[PDB]
Scaffold this active site. Structure first.
Site, PDB file in Angstrom:
ATOM      1  CD1 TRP A 235      34.365  33.916  39.200  1.00  0.00           C
ATOM      2  CD2 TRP A 235      32.287  34.346  38.530  1.00  0.00           C
ATOM      3  NE1 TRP A 235      34.204  35.269  39.199  1.00  0.00           N
ATOM      4  CE2 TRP A 235      32.934  35.562  38.791  1.00  0.00           C
ATOM      5  CE3 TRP A 235      30.967  34.377  38.081  1.00  0.00           C
ATOM      6  CZ2 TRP A 235      32.313  36.795  38.605  1.00  0.00           C
ATOM      7  CZ3 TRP A 235      30.356  35.595  37.907  1.00  0.00           C
ATOM      8  CH2 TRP A 235      31.025  36.779  38.173  1.00  0.00           C
TER       9      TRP A 235
ATOM     10  CE  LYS B  59      34.675  34.449  35.065  1.00  0.00           C
ATOM     11  NZ  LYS B  59      34.371  35.867  34.769  1.00  0.00           N
TER      12      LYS B  59
ATOM     13  CD  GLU C   5      40.419  34.668  38.742  1.00  0.00           C
ATOM     14  OE1 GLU C   5      40.056  33.815  39.546  1.00  0.00           O
ATOM     15  OE2 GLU C   5      39.646  35.588  38.387  1.00  0.00           O
TER      16      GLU C   5
ATOM     17  CB  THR D 106      38.778  34.741  43.304  1.00  0.00           C
ATOM     18  OG1 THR D 106      39.280  35.588  42.260  1.00  0.00           O
ATOM     19  CG2 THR D 106      39.927  33.905  43.855  1.00  0.00           C
TER      20      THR D 106
ATOM     21  CB  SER E 208      34.121  46.546  25.597  1.00  0.00           C
ATOM     22  OG  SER E 208      33.254  45.472  25.278  1.00  0.00           O
TER      23      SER E 208
ATOM     24  CB  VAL F 110      41.228  42.137  44.662  1.00  0.00           C
ATOM     25  CG1 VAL F 110      39.934  41.627  45.237  1.00  0.00           C
ATOM     26  CG2 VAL F 110      42.294  42.196  45.731  1.00  0.00           C
ATOM     27  CG  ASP F 111      37.024  42.455  39.928  1.00  0.00           C
ATOM     28  OD1 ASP F 111      36.773  41.312  39.476  1.00  0.00           O
ATOM     29  OD2 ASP F 111      36.463  43.440  39.428  1.00  0.00           O
ATOM     30  N   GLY F 112      39.861  42.226  38.216  1.00  0.00           N
ATOM     31  CA  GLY F 112      40.252  42.906  36.984  1.00  0.00           C
ATOM     32  C   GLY F 112      41.352  42.247  36.176  1.00  0.00           C
TER      33      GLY F 112
ATOM     34  CG  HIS G 216      39.510  38.578  31.753  1.00  0.00           C
ATOM     35  ND1 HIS G 216      39.127  38.010  32.945  1.00  0.00           N
ATOM     36  CD2 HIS G 216      39.774  37.556  30.913  1.00  0.00           C
ATOM     37  CE1 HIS G 216      39.140  36.692  32.805  1.00  0.00           C
ATOM     38  NE2 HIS G 216      39.526  36.394  31.583  1.00  0.00           N
TER      39      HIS G 216
HETATM   40 NA    NA Z   1      38.336  36.247  40.133  1.00  0.00          NA
END
Ligand code: NA
Length: 232
Positions: A92, A211, A20, A213, A33, A58-60, A62
């Protein structure tokens, strides 16, 4: 669900493949951050792409993109079996605080249609249109993947310009509850992809709009404590 300390492994960033697009604010916030704190604490979630030595992010997204922008080489990662039944995927819900008429004008300027349609949410959830835009009124934005990307581009631009406040809700019910309370004005509803659709997309080198997934596991990986310098 329980928090679980899971063993991570460092994976080279150049082996990770996105599914994505990014939200500019989320990218910049991550970079701020991690550089300000000096600590990377949330592992990547990855899954191997069959027939390759590459990984689906899968996640991460950014975190990966921010680390690449900073010139890092690796990131701590948890490697999942993507087609394990315990790995679930949702979406989302982009929502905003702002003037829907301004948003609609900007959408139309990008070549999108915005059509009042009381069945928009149902059509969106069936994957028949790009998004439903739901608030006081109900609108259909016809199309598919490319139109979802056009909508998201407009939202990111308006977010950056502070014309709207752009927030992403995990649960549609929460977005609707906050609209009732007057905290947000409108929510964008689309159908979540299946895991099979995510893996098919990454296998053809394509990405969804930002966003798309929202993955959930049977546990929450406990946070980790890795120095940013160790990623270089
Ligand atoms: Na996602």
């Amino acid at each position: 669900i329980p928090v679980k300390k899971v063993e991570y492994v460092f994976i080279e960033l150049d082996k990770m493949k996105p599914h994505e697009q990014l939200v500019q604010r989320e990218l910049e916030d991550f970079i701020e951050s991690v550089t300000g704190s000096g600590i990377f604490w949330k592992p990547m979630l990855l899954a191997k792409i069959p027939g390759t030595d590459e990984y689906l992010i899968v996640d991460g997204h950014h975190r990966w993109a921010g680390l690449q922008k900073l010139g890092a080489k690796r990131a701590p990662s948890v490697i999942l079996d993507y087609f394990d039944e315990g790995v679930k995927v949702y979406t989302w819900y982009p929502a905003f605080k702002g003037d829907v008429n301004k948003v609609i004008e900007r959408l139309k300027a990008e070549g999108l249609e915005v059509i009042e349609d009381e069945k928009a949410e149902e059509k969106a959830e069936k994957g028949e249109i790009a998004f439903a835009l739901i608030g006081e009124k109900s609108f259909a934005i016809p199309g598919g993947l490319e139109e979802q990307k056009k909508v998201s581009k407009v939202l990111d631009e308006m977010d950056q310009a502070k014309e709207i406040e752009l927030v992403y809700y995990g649960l549609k019910e929460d977005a609707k509850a906050d609209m009732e309370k007057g905290e947000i004005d409108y929510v964008f509803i689309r159908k979540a992809p299946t895991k099979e659709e995510v893996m098919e997309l990454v296998k053809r080198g394509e990405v969804f709009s930002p966003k798309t997934t929202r993955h959930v596991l049977p546990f929450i990986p406990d946070k980790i404590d890795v120095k940013l310098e160790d990623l270089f």
